[PDB]
Ligand binder design. Structure first.
Ligand SMILES: CN(C)CCCOc1ccc(-c2cc(NCCCn3cccn3)nc(S(C)(=O)=O)n2)cc1
Length: 102
């Protein structure tokens, strides 16, 4: 019953104005040397793939992947960059919705 809310939250994040950096895996042709720094990439497409296939055994596991998206953003980008700002917006949005649903 808790896992059904993850799809709803995922859809809301996919639709958010600030979500553009996170929709698909980082493209290494666009973001030079990404994997030198980010050893465990994550993105909303990968999360959708796993959620749709029972790859999350609990809502907590889904939340951990959401936070990994934002933690990787914060590790790679300065807070005042456009992508860094987007990550902070999305983390706040995610955490707020998580509290409402749970
Ligand atoms: C072809 N299709 C329309 C592309 C649409 C999506 O394009 C993206 C998506 C995500 C990025 C990107 C970048 C970045 N740090 C660098 C910021 C400076 N920058 C370098 C290249 C571009 N901007 N960090 C991150 S993340 C996920 O670690 O926070 N994600 C980039 C492009």
């Amino acid at each position: 019953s808790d896992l059904t809310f993850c799809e709803i939250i995922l859809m809301e994040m996919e639709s958010h104005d600030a979500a553009w950096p996170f929709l698909e895996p980082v493209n290494p042709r666009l973001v030079s040397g990404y994997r030198r720094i980010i050893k465990n990439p994550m993105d909303f497409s990968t999360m959708r793939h796993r959620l749709s296939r029972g790859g999350y055994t609990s809502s907590e596991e889904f939340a951990a992947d959401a936070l990994l998206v934002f933690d990787n953003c914060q590790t790679f980008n300065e807070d005042d960059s456009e992508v860094g700002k987007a990550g902070h917006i999305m983390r706040r949005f995610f955490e707020s919705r998580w509290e409402e649903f749970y």
